[PDB]
Amino acid sequence: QESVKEFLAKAKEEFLKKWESPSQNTAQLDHFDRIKTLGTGSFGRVMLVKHKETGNHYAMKILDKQKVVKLKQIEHTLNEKRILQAVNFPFLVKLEFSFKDNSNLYMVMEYVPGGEMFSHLRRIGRFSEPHARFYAAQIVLTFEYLHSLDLIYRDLKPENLLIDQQGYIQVTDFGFAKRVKGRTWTLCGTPEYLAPEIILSKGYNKAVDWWALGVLIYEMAAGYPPFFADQPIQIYEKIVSGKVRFPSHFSSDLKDLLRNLLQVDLTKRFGNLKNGVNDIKNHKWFATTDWIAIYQRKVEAPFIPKFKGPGDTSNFDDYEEEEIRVSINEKCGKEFTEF
Ligand SMILES: O=C(c1ccccc1)N1CCN2C(=O)OC[C@H]2C1
């Protein structure tokens, strides 16, 4: 409808204005108190912090510049910050501040205290079809938004979907997202979620996000992903094969949607045909979904996470607490000039 077309046109206008003139240097480290490490690893660290003047809580992503260079993530890190400062959608975590110092890059995001979808899925075992469909509808709308801005997300998985105080999804981690007109070539993502054309080193497009949605829906409704194996090489052989097995408790409508999202031939995959996202939105598995009410956050969620307040960390896990050190000399200044 014309209302959807005009919404997406305005969404693109507003993205492009911030994309062409990015914000920079909007806070500094000694404006915050450090509380607790919420995650660590290949993505850097994420730390719960509290702003010393306002009292607000934030999730601060800290990247070590020297390690970013050695791991060949310079362009990806610049992508992440430039995109996050330019987007705006109900199901994306908001970037509030960004800055850099002699040693590190910092992205200060809103703190979502309900935890990762991954934790709740593994605790309950599997989600009922109505519960999985509620989350899936939010991802469909989010990808419609991102793809209309020429953005590919490239890291869909349960660990990257946080559950908020209303029971709705907020997507975090734009480390692999990129603005792409046409094809792109970089090997990235997490093994269980990679489309065949990534594994085969082809030039690929936004259809890889719709494949990943198929993997997510299967995992939410079954409790485990469709191409599971013990080692990555064995996972890749299953992905390229073009065969899956569905649990008997899956409905016929769910099986039909999944066969069309998990289509090995990218030219035949739902989301990538002449009708685009509407082949997904109009599928029988989504017949009960009120797309407008979901966007407006007017549907009652299947469950609300248990937590005590905006600073509660009980839904995240425990990590060794390490220093945030800042060298007396500047490191890698030229490489990160635009950050
Ligand atoms: O940024 C976060 C976060 C971590 C803790 C609290 C809030 C947010 N992530 C979740 C875990 N993550 C992965 O498993 O890989 C990507 C990374 C993203």
UniProtKB/Swiss-Prot annotation:
Active-site feature positions: D155
Any one GO cellular component localisation term in the record: cytosol
Modified residues (Phosphotyrosine): Y319
Molecular-function annotations in GO: ATP binding; cAMP-dependent protein kinase activity; magnesium ion binding; manganese ion binding; protein domain specific binding; protein kinase A regulatory subunit binding; protein kinase binding; protein serine kinase activity
Record EC number: 2.7.11.11
Catalytic activity of the protein: L-seryl-[protein] + ATP = O-phospho-L-seryl-[protein] + ADP + H(+); L-threonyl-[protein] + ATP = O-phospho-L-threonyl-[protein] + ADP + H(+)
Keywords per UniProt: ATP-binding, cAMP, Cell membrane, Cytoplasm, Kinase, Lipoprotein, Membrane, Mitochondrion, Myristate, Nucleotide-binding, Nucleus, Phosphoprotein, Serine/threonine-protein kinase, Transferase
Residues at which ATP binds: 38-46, 61, 110-116, 157-160
Annotated AGC-kinase C-terminal domain residues: 287-339
Means of activity regulation: Allosterically activated by various compounds, including ATP. Activated by cAMP; the nucleotide acts as a dynamic and allosteric activator by coupling the two lobes of apo PKA, enhancing the enzyme dynamics synchronously and priming it for catalysis.
Gene Ontology BP annotations: adenylate cyclase-activating G protein-coupled receptor signaling pathway; adenylate cyclase-inhibiting G protein-coupled receptor signaling pathway; cellular response to cold; cellular response to glucagon stimulus; cellular response to glucose stimulus; cellular response to heat; cellular response to parathyroid hormone stimulus; intracellular potassium ion homeostasis
Residues annotated as domain Protein kinase: 32-286
Enzyme class name: transferase
SMART domains from the UniProt entry: S_TK_X, S_TKc
Keyword Cell membrane on entry: yes
Membrane-protein topology: Lipid-anchor
Pfam families: Pkinase
Modified residues (Phosphothreonine): T37, T184, T186
Expressed in which tissues: Ubiquitously expressed in mammalian tissues.
Keyword Transit peptide: no
Post-translation changes: Autophosphorylated. Phosphorylation is enhanced by vitamin K(2). Phosphorylated on threonine and serine residues. Phosphorylation on Thr-186 is required for full activity. Phosphorylated at Tyr-319 by activated receptor tyrosine kinases EGFR and PDGFR; this increases catalytic efficiency.
Main function: Phosphorylates a large number of substrates in the cytoplasm and the nucleus. Phosphorylates CDC25B, ABL1, NFKB1, CLDN3, PSMC5/RPT6, PJA2, RYR2, RORA, SOX9 and VASP. Regulates the abundance of compartmentalized pools of its regulatory subunits through phosphorylation of PJA2 which binds and ubiquitinates these subunits, leading to their subsequent proteolysis. RORA is activated by phosphorylation. Required for glucose-mediated adipogenic differentiation increase and osteogenic differentiation inhibition from osteoblasts. Involved in chondrogenesis by mediating phosphorylation of SOX9.
Quaternary state and interactors: A number of inactive tetrameric holoenzymes are produced by the combination of homo- or heterodimers of the different regulatory subunits associated with two catalytic subunits. cAMP causes the dissociation of the inactive holoenzyme into a dimer of regulatory subunits bound to four cAMP and two free monomeric catalytic subunits. Activates cAMP-sensitive PKAI and PKAII holoenzymes by interacting with regulatory subunit (R) of PKA, PRKAR1A/PKR1 and PRKAR2A/PKR2, respectively. Interacts with NFKB1, NFKB2 and NFKBIA in platelets; these interactions are disrupted by thrombin and collagen.
Family stated for the protein in its record: Belongs to the protein kinase superfamily. AGC Ser/Thr protein kinase family. cAMP subfamily.
Official protein name in the record: cAMP-dependent protein kinase catalytic subunit alpha
Species of origin: Cricetulus griseus (Chinese hamster)
